[PDB]
Write a protein that binds this ligand. Structure first.
Ligand SMILES: CC(C)(C)c1cc(NC(=O)Nc2ccc(Oc3ccncc3)cc2)no1
Ligand SMILES: CC(C)(C)c1cc(NC(=O)Nc2ccc(Oc3ccncc3)cc2)no1
Lengths: 278, 278
């Protein structure tokens, strides 16, 4: 069973506002004139360019799942080229974790749910035919919906989530199935700590040197003893960011370890975590 | 840009417990072994039977939107035939409105959000090429997700895709004014928490009354004066269920009416209404 991705005429996008700018182009918010929903527009502002947008659209359309940014349509016009997705109103994980004045507390149930949902999403990509690999997993690429549920995106930067064997890339390093789990381990650490990994280091180049020798600090300072399931978590972090790519777990194995942890949290506590953020 | 609907092997559908039966098919709650998610399966409990299921999967896959039940894949084997969708943990709108012991209080902010989302999902269906017309809209087909957001479904106890309370009179014996009629009945039901035609014993007695231009009661008893935007909501109801199909509004008009009503609610009030249910 096949399904075509809708084509959205640029003029059907009303109330267009700039959100961000960088690599792969600019991101804008808008409303669909006929659908009456708020949308996000990732666009370029010539033939090779056209093919890139069409390829991203196809991946996003095929990667359709509960914890993946939902694509709504494509703008493929002489005057405009862009990807139209659902609008994520609560920014990224990065902004939740590090805007500490705006967000004083981020309750453990919400933190563990975010971790469980990142793993559910990456796991799904890894189970496609053929497997889909992110290879640029970072806190900026973890979008949060209205109820602070995860949608994995790719904004198209930091080296802190990169496995050391990816530093000098090749045909084997780009085909690595143990890259995402390294990034996940650092994300897992950054979520439980609310600390910028390798904060004390001066140069990203020095971080690369440090990393290649053999990680961000696992102590009482960074990770206090009151962290729910601390031991099992630390064991998962250490295991995921292990210098030997073969000494790294699958996302399925992490999920199986995470499933009992999430059950120790009462359903109400997730709703209370979110009300606390508003 | 085409997307193939994933094929799920029956053996990946762990803990397959039944939920509800019908003359056409059955609905069961499984758990995907690889994806680690709770799912719903609508299966046949062969030539024609196969074409019927695949046509429903083709419709659901093409109808993908924020307020339509998301299809995760098809389970097409000589042993088993079923559609895998996401699992809606909070039941249906019928249950929320009429299980008054379970839910003594369903706050206005949530009621309006539900009505807005029914209209968004129906409006999207009508905007497809060719337009998809539900024609069997009822509270039972309005499913409630983890966060009490709407997912429009089509339960098929009688037939796969291709009560008379929500049916317009002209339909007793193609119409693009049916779903709006059904929508007007649902709106009345949501705001009153009453069963349409409470004293009427026989469905033929409803069919007779309706054909004579009579509708569910609109007074202080059914619709209290304390209802936010009462006058405005009654006008929408009365337009929606008009005897003359042509006097009924489009979903665009209906959404343009709803939009300023929903803006009057602070975002936190929706969260608070949902927590009050937990
Ligand atoms: C399948 C996966 C590997 C995860 C992926 C995502 C992707 N494109 C993308 O995320 N595009 C994108 C990114 C950020 C955007 O910005 C938003 C979105 C929603 N709300 C606010 C900003 C919009 C589109 N291509 O492959
Ligand atoms: C586009 C639209 C007209 C709205 C539609 C729905 C549909 N099929 C369907 O909903 N099938 C279905 C219904 C109920 C199910 O049972 C569930 C689903 C989720 N959670 C609990 C029970 C499973 C599949 N075909 O066209």
């Amino acid at each position: 069973i096949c399904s075509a991705l809708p084509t959205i005429p640029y003029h059907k996008l009303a109330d267009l506002r700039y959100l961000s700018r960088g690599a792969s182009g600019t991101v804008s918010s808008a409303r669909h004139a006929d659908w009456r929903v708020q949308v996000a527009v990732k666009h370029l502002h010539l033939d090779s360019e056209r093919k890139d947008v069409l390829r991203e659209a196809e991946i996003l359309h095929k990667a359709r799942f509960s914890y993946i940014l939902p694509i709504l349509g494509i703008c493929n016009e002489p005057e405009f080229l862009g990807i139209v997705t659902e609008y994520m109103p609560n920014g990224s994980l990065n902004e939740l974790l590090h805007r500490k004045t705006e967000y004083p507390d981020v309750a453990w149930p919400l933190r563990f749910r975010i971790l469980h949902e990142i793993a559910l999403g990456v796991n799904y990509l890894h189970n496609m035919t053929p497997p889909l690999l992110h290879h640029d997993l970072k806190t900026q690429n973890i979008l949060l919906d209205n109820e602070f549920h995860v949608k994995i995106a790719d904004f198209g930067g930091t080296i802190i989530y990169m496995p050391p064997e990816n530093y000098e890339p090749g045909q084997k390093s780009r085909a690595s199935i143990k890259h995402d789990i390294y990034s996940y381990a650092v994300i897992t650490w950054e979520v439980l700590s609310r600390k910028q990994p390798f904060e004390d280091v001066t140069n990203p180049l020095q971080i690369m040197y440090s990393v290649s020798q053999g990680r961000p600090v696992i102590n009482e300072e960074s990770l206090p003893y009151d962290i729910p399931h601390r031991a099992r978590m630390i064991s998962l972090i250490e295991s995921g960011w292990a210098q030997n790519p073969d000494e790294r777990p699958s996302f399925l194995k992490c999920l199986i370890e995470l499933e009992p942890v999430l059950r120790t949290f009462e359903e109400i506590t997730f709703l209370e975590a979110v009300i606390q953020l508003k």
